[PDB]
Amino acid sequence: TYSPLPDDYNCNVELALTSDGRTIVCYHPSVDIPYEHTKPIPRPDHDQVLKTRLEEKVEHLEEGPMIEQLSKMFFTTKHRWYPHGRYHRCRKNLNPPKDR
Amino acid sequence: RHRRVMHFQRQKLMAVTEYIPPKPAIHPSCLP
């Protein structure tokens, strides 16, 4: 039949005027994702006489290389990673208003 | 001596009053 919009996403919309014609009624139930359209949850992942060692993977990196790594990882420019002076740091409100 | 600039209101008037030629529904050459 005729649909104003496709009904394969978000919800199925049925538009109907009332008999008097003064009210528009919209029936929009949710469209549940079909099981077929889903993927299975990805499953995560010797002479070891000595205990396993929790080697610290914390490597020192200089500011330039460290900022370059952060910028690449988050797809940002380098500027945001540099610090700012005391004047701006103290200006920031550390008890901002919160709405719900 | 050179075509002087017109007041833009006048230029707007000229454009709105430009000749519009009649367009036949069927081209004359396309008819017997």
Partner: protein
């Protein structure tokens, strides 16, 4: 094969745990869009 809940997460484990919380909210009738508490004077 019938969806009961769906949840978002930054990791698959976090999303799976959130989905469980969403399912529990629906089962216990404590969803975010449930009928609000009625304060109308008894009548």
């Amino acid at each position: 094969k019938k969806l009961i809940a769906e949840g978002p997460g930054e990791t698959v484990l976090v999303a799976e745990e959130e989905a469980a919380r969403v399912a529990l909210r629906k089962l216990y009738g404590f969803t975010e869009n449930r009928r609000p508490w009625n304060y109308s004077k008894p009548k």
